[PDB]
Symmetry: C2
Subunit: 236 residues, 2 copies
Amino acid sequence: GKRVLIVDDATNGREAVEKYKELKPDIVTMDITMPEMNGIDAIKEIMKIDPNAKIIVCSAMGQQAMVIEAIKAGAKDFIVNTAAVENPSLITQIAQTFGSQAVVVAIDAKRVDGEFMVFTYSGKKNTGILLRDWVVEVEKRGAGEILLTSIDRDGTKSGYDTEMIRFVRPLTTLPIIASGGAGKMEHFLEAFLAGADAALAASVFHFREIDVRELKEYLKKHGVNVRLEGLLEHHH
Amino acid sequence: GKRVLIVDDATNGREAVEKYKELKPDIVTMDITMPEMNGIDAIKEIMKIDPNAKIIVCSAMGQQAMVIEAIKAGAKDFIVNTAAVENPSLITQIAQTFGSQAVVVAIDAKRVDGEFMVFTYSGKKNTGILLRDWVVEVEKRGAGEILLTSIDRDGTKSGYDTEMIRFVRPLTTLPIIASGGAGKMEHFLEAFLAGADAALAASVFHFREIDVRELKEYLKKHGVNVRLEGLLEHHH
């Protein structure tokens, strides 16, 4: 690409096999955690109504029991955050089975005392690990793509963390999907200019702050390659 | 009180009827949304192992179908956020059935252009409604307590929004549980001093930034009344 990711996030269903065919999206993402809500049962139906893919499983943590059963259903790809920080090897582990392609590492970052630092458990434990460090590590461990979310920007509807991107950019060769403060059409350009290979966004379209057709034409009128895709997800 | 609320948040279970007896807490909170995860089935077991209470149901939105069944199980109290903003009457509605006591209105606030504004859908739609307005409205509609969460502070581990509290304080007589940036022992005092009748916190204890025994003694050594309680919750 790049590469703009339009998200529909629904939700605890059920509201999947219904939304999937009616929205023909390029991902989905599936939270499967704890053996209670029809995660695995959902996938099978898709892997039927469309034998292809592309489902990305949300593995973390300790409920691997489910992940295994999910892969038996046809799951080929995964994102990881906390469980990779606990155990960096877990990446190499997957990447060896399914290839580097198959693994995306989500990274949650926040600047503390003028220093980019990593945060886990849905962005709350300050790991005391410099972002700069983890980035390199993650690549060497065998990642595919980095899902850099800026906490200092997440939900500020005030722009992507173009600074955090630039910081990460030269430290890697891997694609970088950028996440955080999607605010206006202009903000997407800045992200691409920073280095981000992809931009993710939910709130702006959901609430029609921004028109997806218009955003395509805007970026087109500036000479950018895109390429926009449909995400889809349960749960939190 | 006041009044400090220690939260254990677990999680999609199941990890309830096990945690409840072993943790003897004063709340719980129960997310029941969509007929899939054992919300209602959980309550019944408690309402058995302890016929008393005190369960607070998380009603919102449109899945009232479940809420009704939940009340049949013995639910007496509720919190509301988005669905109250959509339909202010919904408060009067509950408060008439179960009394003003029974209803807590969560308010999500963020300052925009030097103006406290309300946000819905897990804090993302700018309602274009001044906090000052909703506060009064909510009381007149028949609320019991206000669960003021500061977005500009939520997860900053940098102090409560002592400014937002002071703003709300004189506009009401209702109790105010304060939520947001629980950072250090000192930060709890400031909150109480601001007007907050209660402080809620999860991250600080979970990750043992702060010791609960120590926090009691700290506030005691400053002459405060407390009074600390155990929350417990699924899910997001």
